[PDB]
Design a protein around this ligand. Structure first.
Ligand SMILES: [Cl-]
Length: 130
C-alpha cells in the first residue's frame, strides 16, 4: 500500500493513489498503460516507511509494500541504503534510504499485467501491486 498523496503517472497525466478507481489506467513497468483490476478501501493506522530513491523520488508506503530489486523482492522495511537497486524487465534507481515515519492513510491496487508492477512517484519508480 502507498500513501494516498502518492502521485502516479497515467497515460494522460498524473493521479494520486487516493483518486484511483477500478478500471483506471496506470503505467506498467514497461511504461505502457495497465488497467486497475482492484483497489482497496483507505486503510488507516498502518506502519509506514519513507523510501527515498537516487532520482529524488520519495514515496511513503506501508512496511510490507513490495519493491522489485536486483537481488529480490524486498518490503519497504527491508530496503537497504546503497545495497539495493530497483530493476525491471535494466537498472532504474538506487535506494538511498528507507526509514520508519508516522502512519498516514494508504491504499493498495491490483493491476492487470502479469508482473504485478506499476510506476509510482514523480520519478515513475516501478513498484509491486497486491
Ligand atoms: Cl525474491
Amino acid at each position: 500500500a502507498l500513501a494516498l498523496y502518492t502521485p502516479l503517472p497515467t497515460p494522460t497525466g498524473w493521479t494520486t493513489m487516493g483518486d484511483v478507481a477500478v478500471g483506471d489506467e496506470l503505467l506498467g513497468a514497461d511504461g505502457k498503460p495497465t488497467r486497475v483490476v482492484a483497489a482497496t478501501d483507505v486503510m488507516l493506522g498502518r506502519p509506514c516507511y519513507e523510501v527515498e530513491f537516487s532520482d529524488g523520488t520519495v514515496i511513503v508506503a506501508d512496511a510490507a509494500h513490495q519493491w522489485p530489486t536486483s537481488g529480490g523482492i524486498r518490503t519497504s522495511a527491508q530496503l537497504r541504503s546503497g545495497a539495493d537497486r530497483i530493476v525491471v524487465a535494466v537498472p532504474v534507481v538506487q535506494i538511498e534510504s528507507a526509514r520508519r515515519v508516522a502512519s498516514v492513510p494508504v491504499r493498495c491496487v491490483e493491476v492487470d499485467n502479469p508482473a504485478h508492477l506499476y510506476l509510482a512517484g514523480r520519478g515513475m519508480v516501478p513498484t509491486h501491486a497486491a
